Design a protein around this ligand. Structure first.
Ligand SMILES: [Mg+2]
Ligand SMILES: [Mg+2]
Ligand SMILES: [Mg+2]
Ligand SMILES: [Mg+2]
Ligand SMILES: [Mg+2]
Ligand SMILES: [Mg+2]
Ligand SMILES: [Mg+2]
Ligand SMILES: [Mg+2]
Ligand SMILES: [Mg+2]
Ligand SMILES: [Mg+2]
Ligand SMILES: [Mg+2]
Ligand SMILES: [Mg+2]
Ligand SMILES: [Mg+2]
Ligand SMILES: [Mg+2]
Ligand SMILES: [Mg+2]
Ligand SMILES: [Mg+2]
Ligand SMILES: [Mg+2]
Ligand SMILES: [Mg+2]
Ligand SMILES: [Mg+2]
Ligand SMILES: [Mg+2]
Ligand SMILES: [Mg+2]
Ligand SMILES: [Mg+2]
Ligand SMILES: [Mg+2]
Ligand SMILES: [Mg+2]
Ligand SMILES: [Mg+2]
Ligand SMILES: [Mg+2]
Ligand SMILES: [Mg+2]
Ligand SMILES: [Mg+2]
Ligand SMILES: [Mg+2]
Ligand SMILES: [Mg+2]
Ligand SMILES: [Mg+2]
Ligand SMILES: [Mg+2]
Ligand SMILES: [Mg+2]
Ligand SMILES: [Mg+2]
Ligand SMILES: [Zn+2]
Lengths: 86, 60, 52, 134, 105, 135, 50, 122
RNA sequence: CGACUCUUAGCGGUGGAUCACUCGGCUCGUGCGUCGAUGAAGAACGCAGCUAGCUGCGAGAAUUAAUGUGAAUUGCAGGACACAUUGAUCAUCGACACUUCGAACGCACUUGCGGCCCCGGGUUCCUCCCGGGGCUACGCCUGUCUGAGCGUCGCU
RNA sequence: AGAUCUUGGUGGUAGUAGCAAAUAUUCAAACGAGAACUUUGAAGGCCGAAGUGGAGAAGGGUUCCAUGUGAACAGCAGUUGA
RNA sequence: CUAAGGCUAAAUACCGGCACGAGACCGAUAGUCAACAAGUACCGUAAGGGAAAGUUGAAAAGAACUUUGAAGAGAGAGUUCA
RNA sequence: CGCGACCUCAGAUCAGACGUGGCGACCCGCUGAAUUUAAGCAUAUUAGUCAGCGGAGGAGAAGAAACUAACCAGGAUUCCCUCAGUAACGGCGAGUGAACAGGGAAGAGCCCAGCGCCGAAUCCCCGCCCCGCGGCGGGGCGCGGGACAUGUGGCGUACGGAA
C-alpha cells in the first residue's frame, strides 16, 4: 500500500538542523544543507527565487555591526575622541 | 542543591562552592534540567553539616 | 508610470489665452460672474501706485 | 506658510511623530500657558508642565477658578493629574481624571535653578525678537 | 490582420521593451542640478570666464555643412607657434589647445 | 576550443543550437591564464602577461603580478594606481590587455558594437525606449 | 527519544520555556492589543520543526 | 545610596576589585532571597546591584585600556584592539603622505606651468 | 378555532456589508552612497522583580560610561533622585564591553579530542591532576632562518 | 445576475444520515449541585505468557508526578483526562 | 592614423542601503504578502509555499451593592450624552 | 674531499602585511535557452534576453585615434536631441537595424618600455636620536642588512626628443 500503510514506516530523519542558517535542511547522508549549502564557503542563493532571497537577505536579522556602522557614518567614523567634559 | 552555569564542570563547581562558602565537599553530581539549566547536587564532607550550611546561606 | 501625464501647448496659443484672460479681467460683468465682489471698486482695471 | 523643504506638512508624518515622540520632547509637547500675572512677571508665554506647580482648568467638565497642584505628569498618555480633579468610581474609590496640559493655565511655577534658567532664556529670546521687529 | 487601406507598420516591440523604459520625471531635477553645478563652478573660478577656454574658429567637415563655421576643440600647435604662445602656457592662461588638429589652408 | 558541457552531447532545443564540437570560447587562452593566476593569487594584482612557449596540448604564459601593499609599490607614484580598490581583479573584469582584446573595444567603423563602453552598454542604450515627459 | 544530543536538548528546552501563557498584568498596559499567547503549541496538535 | 562612576575613577585597582567583589557577594545574596521569596525591596535591589557591578567593571576596563594606550603610544607596532577601526576599506586605503606625494616630473610641471588667475574683457 | 405554509410590517437574533477614520502602502523626486579575519551578513542560545511574543541587548545582557537635556518611569510593586559636595527620564553616542556557530581559523561535528608556552592550586619543581591566560586554518607578498640538488662553477 | 467566476457569510437537506469490527456487564457506598461512564468494595466476564502483561530501540518532547478548575477539547456524559 | 604597454575627473546609471520631501494614487477582499507579536501562525523530508487578523468611550468613568442559580447566565441598581 | 659563490627549489605557529565571505538596484567579464512570432516549421524571431558563474565602486565601464572623412575638412571618452525605423541585414518572409556629419551637457590631459646620457644617481627593511601621534610622517645617524647591472632612479614619449 503506497499510502496510509507506507506512511507508518517513516522513522528516520533525512534532514537535521544546519549549524549555519539554523534551518532544518542539513542532509545528513550528503552532509550538505539544501538551503545554504553549508560546507560550501559561499551561500546558496538563486535569482529564480526572489522570495527566498528576501527571506534571508541583509536586514532580516539583527545587523548588530551594520546598525553601528550606519550610525557611525553620520559623523565620519570618528574614533579616539570624547565629548567635551562638563 | 545548586543551579549552576551550564558551562561549568564538576571541578569548577567544587572549587566555586569551596571558595565562596568555605566548606569542604565530598562529591558533585550534575544534571541538565529539561528547562536548560544545570543542577548540581554537591555532597559535603562528613565533618560539614549541610543543614547549618544552608542556614548560614539563608535557604532554610 | 509612463501614462503621458504632460501635454505640450503651442506658445502662440498660450499667449493667446493669456491675452484673453487679461482682456476679460477688465470687464466688470465677467469678474462679477467669477464672483469677486467688485461693487465698490473705483475702476475695474485697478491700478495702484508703485509705492505698494 | 511653511517654506522649509526639510519640515513636512504631511498629516500622517506629523501624527506619527507626535504619537511616537520620546519623553524628552513629549515634555515640550505637554506645555501649558502661564497666567496673565505670570506672563507679566516673566516675559514668557508658555511653559512645559512640571510635577509640583499649581494650575487651574479652563476647559471641560472641571472648569473653574479653583487652584490645584499637579500630582503627576503622565507623559505616556499625554495627561496630567491635579489635586481635586478626580471622580468616584463604582467601588467608591477616587481616581484622578487626566486632562491635557494645554487645557490648563499655570498660576504658580515650581521654581528651581533649571526652571529659572529656562525662564530667562525664553525671556531673552523674546526680547531679542522684539528688538529685531521694532 | 490588415483592414482596408493603411500603412504597413513594423513596430519594434517584440523584444520585452517594458523592462527597459527610461522615464524623464527627473528632467526638471536634472536641469536644476546642472544649473547649480554651473553656478558653483563659476563661483569657484571667480574672474575666469564661466564657459571656459577660448575655442578656435573651425569649418564644419562635410559638403552639407562646409558653408557654416563653429567652435572647435582647441587651437592647433601651428596656430600657437605663429601666434607666439607656448603650448604649455596656453592652457594655464585659458587657451584650449588641440595637438592633433592640422592646418590644411 | 570549448566543448559544450552537456551530457552525451544532448543540447535539447532547435538544431541551430545542436553544436557541441567546433565551438570557441569568447576569451583567449592568455586571458584564461591571467584569470587563473589572479584567482590563485587573489591578494595580488594582475598587470599583464606574455607568451613563453606552446605545445600541441599546452600554451605557456608568464603573468606579471603586483603586490599592492608592498611599500615599494605603495610609496611610488605612477604605480599607486594599481593599489586603488577599483583596480582589483582586472583580469576577471577584462581590464588587462589580453582580457580587453576580446571585448571588441576600439575607435571607428569596425567597433560600433561597443559605443558607450561595452556591448551591454551599447545594447541597453539602443534597446531602451526613451519616454520623455512631453511626447 | 531518550538518547539525544545536547543541541537537541537545548532546542527542546527553549521550546518548553516559551510555551506558556502571557502574564495577567500585560493586559493592563497602556495600548496592549494582546489578548492571549497566539504562539502556544501543544505536543499532540502540532509537531516541532526537528 | 548608589555608587557613581565619577568617584570610582580616583580609586586604584585593589579597592576597585574589592568593591566589585562585595557587589558580587551582595548580588548572590539577593538571588538567594529571590529564590527563597524574600521581599519586594530586596527583589528591586537586584537591578541596582547589577548596574553597580557594570559600573565598576566598565571603570576598571576603561582605566586599563587608557593605560595600555599610554603605554603603546609612540610605538611602531600596536595591538589590533588599540589600532583604529574606521572601516576595512578605510584601513586599506593610502595614507595622507603617500596619497599626496608626487613625482619629480609632476612637480616640475607644476613649478613651470602653474594655473594663472585671469579675466577676459568683453 | 388551532397547527403548518406564504406575503408584508415592528421588534429581536445571525452576519459583518456600507459609511466615516488611518502611526500602512504604492509612485515620483532629492541628498548621501558606508560591510568583513580589528571577525561581516546570517543563525543559535541566553538577558527584565513580576516577561510568552515583538522590540532591545550580550554574562557589564530591555543595558555601563560620556555628552546634551532637565523631573520622571508606570501595568503593579520597590527604591532612588538636597536637580549644588551634581541629576530621574529621554535623546545623542565619540569611551568601554560585545556568549556560541557562521568566510569561521588547532582537528572535528546529529559526537568529541589534541599540541605548545606562561600563571595559580593540590604538589612542595618534577613533573602528574585541576583551574586561568595566550597561541596552534589555507593561500599569498617582502624579508629572515634552516636546508636540498651526479644544476653551474671556484679553491683545495 | 451569470464567467463549474474570487473572498466571506447563510439556508433547505435536517434534528436527518449517523454515533453497529474485536462476547459484558451488575449491585452497594463515597465525594459531589449533578453519576450508565469517577473512586472504593462485592460479583460475573475477557486478554490467556506468539497477552489487552513486564521492559527497550526509532520517533515524540514534558505528554512524566502532585495539586486545583470544570470555560473550550476528549464526535453521549464526566466529579475523570495524554 | 601609428596597433600589438599604462593611467585619468566631469557630464551618465541606480526597483539594494541610510535620511528626507511630495502626490489629481489606494483606503483594511483595496494598497506591499504583511496598517496588527508577518515572511508570523501554519504546511512540506526538503527545495519551497504562506495567511487571516484595524475601530468601546472624551475619559475606564470597564458596572460597586442586593438578589436566583453549582456555575455559565439573569433581574435590579450604577457610570456615561449614549 | 671538504669548504665557498651563484642558480633552481623546500620547510617554519619565523618578522611584518594582504586575500577569502556578504550585499548585489546601477556596472564589468563570460555562459546562455525555450515559451513566443512566423497563423504549420527547421534558418530567422524571442535574444546575446531569462536562468547560471565570476568581479567591483559610489558610480562602474570607456577614454586621449593604427578615428571620422573626402570637405574650404573635423579631432579623447560618456550622455541627450537628431540622423532614423534610415543605410543595411532577412525562408529579402515574419521581422531586425546602426554609424558619420549637425546642435547641445561636460570638457583635461597624460605616463612608461624602447633609443640615449648621468660613478645605481634608485628602492625596501632593521636599530639610535629629535620633532610629532591621532590615519602613523618628517629630519639626521649606522665600515647596519637586503633588492638591484637578468637594469632602480632623473631627463625624455611621436604634440617629436636629446646634446
Ligand atoms: Mg508512489
Ligand atoms: Mg537516506
Ligand atoms: Mg551525567
Ligand atoms: Mg532558431
Ligand atoms: Mg501524531
Ligand atoms: Mg620618468
Ligand atoms: Mg436585524
Ligand atoms: Mg548614562
Ligand atoms: Mg562519532
Ligand atoms: Mg653543486
Ligand atoms: Mg453578484
Ligand atoms: Mg437517527
Ligand atoms: Mg448506530
Ligand atoms: Mg479466557
Ligand atoms: Mg508489550
Ligand atoms: Mg498523568
Ligand atoms: Mg462530549
Ligand atoms: Mg490586505
Ligand atoms: Mg470595511
Ligand atoms: Mg457552560
Ligand atoms: Mg447612540
Ligand atoms: Mg608569523
Ligand atoms: Mg509558430
Ligand atoms: Mg498560432
Ligand atoms: Mg507549435
Ligand atoms: Mg542573469
Ligand atoms: Mg566577492
Ligand atoms: Mg575607471
Ligand atoms: Mg581605461
Ligand atoms: Mg597618442
Ligand atoms: Mg523621417
Ligand atoms: Mg538582434
Ligand atoms: Mg558646453
Ligand atoms: Mg632608464
Ligand atoms: Zn544551512
Amino acid at each position: 500500500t503506497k499510502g496510509t500503510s507506507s506512511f507508518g514506516k517513516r522513522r528516520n530523519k533525512t534532514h537535521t538542523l544546519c549549524r549555519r542558517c539554523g534551518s532544518k535542511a542539513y542532509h545528513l547522508q550528503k552532509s550538505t544543507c539544501g538551503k545554504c549549502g553549508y560546507p560550501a564557503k559561499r551561500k546558496r542563493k538563486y535569482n529564480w527565487s526572489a522570495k527566498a532571497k528576501r527571506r534571508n537577505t541583509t536586514g532580516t536579522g539583527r545587523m548588530r555591526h551594520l546598525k553601528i556602522v550606519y550610525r557611525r557614518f553620520r559623523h565620519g567614523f570618528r574614533e579616539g575622541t570624547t565629548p567635551k567634559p562638563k | 542543591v545548586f543551579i549552576v552555569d551550564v558551562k561549568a564542570n564538576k571541578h569548577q563547581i567544587k572549587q566555586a562552592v569551596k571558595k565562596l562558602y568555605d566548606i569542604d565537599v565530598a562529591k558533585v553530581n550534575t544534571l541538565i534540567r529539561p528547562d536548560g539549566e544545570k543542577k548540581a547536587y554537591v555532597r559535603l564532607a562528613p565533618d560539614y553539616d549541610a543543614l547549618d550550611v544552608a542556614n548560614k546561606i539563608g535557604i532554610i | 508610470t509612463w501614462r503621458r501625464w504632460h501635454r505640450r501647448v503651442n506658445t502662440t496659443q498660450k499667449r493667446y489665452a493669456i491675452c484673453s484672460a487679461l482682456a476679460a479681467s477688465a470687464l466688470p460683468a465677467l469678474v462679477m460672474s467669477k464672483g469677486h465682489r467688485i461693487e465698490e471698486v473705483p475702476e475695474l482695471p485697478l491700478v495702484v501706485e508703485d509705492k505698494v | 506658510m511653511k517654506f522649509n523643504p526639510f519640515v513636512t506638512s504631511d498629516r500622517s508624518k506629523n501624527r506619527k511623530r507626535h504619537f511616537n515622540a520620546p519623553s524628552h520632547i513629549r515634555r515640550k509637547i505637554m506645555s501649558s500657558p502661564l497666567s496673565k500675572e505670570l506672563r507679566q512677571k516673566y516675559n514668557v508665554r508658555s511653559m512645559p508642565i512640571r510635577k509640583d506647580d499649581e494650575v487651574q482648568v479652563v476647559r471641560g467638565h472641571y472648569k473653574g477658578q479653583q487652584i490645584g497642584k499637579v500630582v503627576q505628569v503622565y507623559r505616556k498618555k499625554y495627561v496630567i493629574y491635579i489635586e481635586r480633579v478626580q471622580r468616584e468610581k463604582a467601588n467608591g474609590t477616587t481616581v484622578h481624571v487626566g486632562i491635557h496640559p494645554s487645557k490648563v493655565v499655570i498660576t504658580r511655577l515650581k521654581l528651581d535653578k533649571d526652571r529659572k534658567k529656562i525662564l530667562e532664556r525664553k525671556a531673552k529670546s523674546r526680547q531679542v525678537g522684539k528688538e529685531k521687529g521694532k | 490582420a490588415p483592414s482596408r487601406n493603411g500603412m504597413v507598420l513594423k513596430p519594434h516591440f517584440h523584444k520585452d521593451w517594458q523592462r527597459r523604459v527610461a522615464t524623464w520625471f527627473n528632467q526638471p531635477a536634472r536641469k536644476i542640478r546642472r544649473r547649480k553645478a554651473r553656478q558653483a563652478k563659476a563661483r569657484r573660478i571667480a574672474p575666469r570666464p564661466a564657459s571656459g577656454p577660448i575655442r578656435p574658429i573651425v569649418r564644419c567637415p562635410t559638403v552639407r555643412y562646409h558653408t557654416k563655421v563653429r567652435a572647435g576643440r582647441g587651437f592647433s600647435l601651428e596656430e600657437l607657434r605663429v601666434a607666439g604662445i607656448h603650448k604649455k602656457v596656453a592652457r594655464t592662461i585659458g587657451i584650449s589647445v588641440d595637438p592633433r588638429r592640422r592646418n590644411k589652408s | 576550443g570549448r566543448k559544450r558541457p552537456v551530457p552525451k552531447g544532448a543540447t535539447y532545443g532547435k538544431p541551430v543550437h545542436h553544436g557541441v564540437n567546433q565551438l570557441k570560447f569568447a576569451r583567449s587562452l592568455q586571458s584564461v591564464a591571467e584569470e587563473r593566476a589572479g584567482r590563485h593569487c587573489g591578494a595580488l594584482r594582475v598587470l599583464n602577461s606574455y607568451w613563453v612557449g606552446e605545445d600541441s596540448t599546452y600554451k605557456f604564459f608568464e603573468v606579471i603580478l603586483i603586490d599592492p601593499f608592498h611599500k615599494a609599490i605603495r610609496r611610488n607614484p605612477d604605480t599607486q594606481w594599481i593599489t586603488k580598490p577599483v583596480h582589483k581583479h582586472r583580469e576577471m573584469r577584462g581590464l588587462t590587455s589580453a582580457g580587453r582584446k576580446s571585448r571588441g573595444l576600439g575607435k571607428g567603423h569596425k567597433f560600433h558594437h561597443t559605443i558607450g563602453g561595452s556591448r551591454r552598454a551599447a545594447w541597453r542604450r539602443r534597446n531602451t525606449l526613451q519616454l520623455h515627459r512631453y511626447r | 527519544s531518550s538518547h539525544k544530543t545536547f543541541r537537541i536538548k537545548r532546542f527542546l528546552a527553549k521550546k518548553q520555556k516559551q510555551n506558556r501563557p502571557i502574564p495577567q498584568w500585560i493586559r493592563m498596559k497602556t495600548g496592549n492589543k494582546i489578548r492571549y499567547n497566539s504562539k502556544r503549541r501543544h505536543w499532540r496538535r502540532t509537531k516541532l520543526g526537528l | 545610596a548608589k555608587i557613581k562612576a565619577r568617584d570610582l575613577r580616583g580609586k586604584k585597582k585593589e579597592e576597585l576589585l574589592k568593591q566589585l567583589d562585595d557587589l558580587k557577594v551582595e548580588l548572590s545574596q539577593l538571588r538567594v532571597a529571590k529564590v527563597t521569596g524574600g521581599a519586594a525591596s530586596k527583589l528591586s535591589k537586584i537591578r541596582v546591584v547589577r548596574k553597580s557591578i557594570a559600573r565598576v567593571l566598565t571603570v576598571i576596563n576603561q582605566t586599563q585600556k587608557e593605560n595600555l594606550r599610554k603605554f603603546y603610544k609612540g610605538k611602531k607596532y600596536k595591538p589590533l584592539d588599540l589600532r583604529p577601526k574606521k572601516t576595512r576599506a578605510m584601513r586599506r586605503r593610502l595614507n595622507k603622505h603617500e596619497e599626496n606625494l608626487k613625482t619629480k616630473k609632476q612637480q616640475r610641471k607644476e613649478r613651470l606651468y602653474p594655473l594663472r588667475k585671469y579675466a577676459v574683457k568683453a
